[PDB]
Symmetry: C2
Subunit: 249 residues, 2 copies
């Protein structure tokens, strides 16, 4: 698998980065040239001692550290891969997280963000007072006056959030949002990280629930990822204990 | 800007990778910890001489070569950045490429791919024979029988391509596609890389043309990119001439 030489120096399949032999014959040609071009650049960079310069050396230290770190993390991940994830862990996860992660569904809604539960509560009562026909415009009006969402505030768009997938918004905000009938709004504020939301649902399409079997690949990945993060965290917290760490602010 | 120390060793803003001071005070906290965690991993990796191992060393050579190469390319790019792109080059580009790159427009269409111009021509005549009402189903039928698009062939979906943006399909295929009235198909084949297409337009929304002024940032970028590629190509072709290059297939 010496694919080419440049000034004698072999180009080989090891010159590539994540399958070469599965590539179309003409794709291969294109890659060999890229690697030829790389090698010509490298030779030139070395002749010019771009690598001995301080700019590069400094930068190379960062790169090497990052590399060494990812290397170490890769190794953590490999201990995880050897562990079988039990079928049971996977169905449990599917059941618990189905509605949150395994439902394709799109909504258009608008929201109002406020700082306190009572402000949110006040906003809901105001809208509650309005005849059905008036509720949407009242929501829009209050959003423009009272929302603290900067973009919403700046846009004066009635707190329009545009269309979003169920799995792509914060979970408890999505649950609330998608739980509504179109044309209704939440009668109870929704606390998040940012404050309290009132959500008005404009529209939503019909949800499609992925089955266990369709979900299972993604589930497997997510559980390994969690095992991996747990593993690394555990190890890093042990390292943390043997070091003297001082923050300056 | 010593943000923290780990066992005496400073963590500094140089530990980060493309602005730290623009970051929210709590974002900063989170980053300092990431870098603390990085440093703990690095220390451990070094104690374990993960860096002296052959696995790593081999991998580090690739990384260093790539780095040295990108470094050299960055430098090429910087000679380009010092050059002012004339207003004239930019309007010319805008005018020439407007319809192709600066029009937001979505279409739903289906196509048939065949190997030769005469096969494509045959398909068009067949459809031409059909009463208006029958043309779509005839197109679908022929696509299923005759298309050579593997996915289309495998799916038997009447060569349905789904919905696509004007700027996100091959240009001459988009021009043809978007030039159609809905419910019409191309009376002339469209040669591309893959063969000859017959395109049937199902639907399209209304196009929005970005103005020069809206386009100009992207235009500037695209022209620098071209200058950059030209520059690098030119330099690399000079290097190519001084080397002995042999491919083995």
């Amino acid at each position: 698998g010496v694919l080419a030489t440049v000034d004698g120096r072999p180009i080989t399949k090891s010159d590539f980065d994540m399958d070469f032999d599965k590539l179309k014959e003409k794709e291969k040609e294109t890659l060999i040239d890229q690697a030829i071009r790389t090698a010509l650049v490298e030779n030139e960079a070395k002749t010019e001692k771009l690598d001995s310069t301080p700019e590069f050396k400094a930068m190379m230290e960062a790169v090497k550290k990052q590399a060494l770190v990812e290397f170490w993390a890769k190794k953590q991940a490999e201990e995880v891969k050897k562990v079988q994830i039990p079928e049971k862990e996977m169905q449990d996860f599917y059941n618990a997280n189905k509605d949150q992660l395994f439902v394709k569904q799109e909504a258009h809604a608008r929201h109002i963000l406020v700082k306190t539960e009572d402000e949110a509560k006040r906003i809901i009562s105001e809208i509650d007072k309005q005849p059905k026909a008036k509720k949407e415009a009242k929501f829009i009006e209050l959003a423009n006056r009272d929302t603290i969402d900067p973009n919403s505030k700046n846009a004066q768009n009635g707190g329009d959030l545009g269309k979003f997938q169920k799995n792509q918004m914060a979970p408890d905000f999505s649950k609330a949002a998608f739980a509504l009938t179109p044309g209704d709004y939440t009668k109870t504020p929704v606390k998040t990280e940012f404050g309290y939301h009132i959500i008005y649902l404009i529209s939503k399409d019909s949800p499609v629930t992925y089955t266990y079997e369709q979900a299972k690949p993604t589930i497997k990945g997510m559980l390994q990822e969690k095992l991996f993060q747990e593993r690394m965290n555990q190890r890093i917290e042990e390292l943390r204990k043997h070091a003297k760490i001082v923050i300056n602010k």
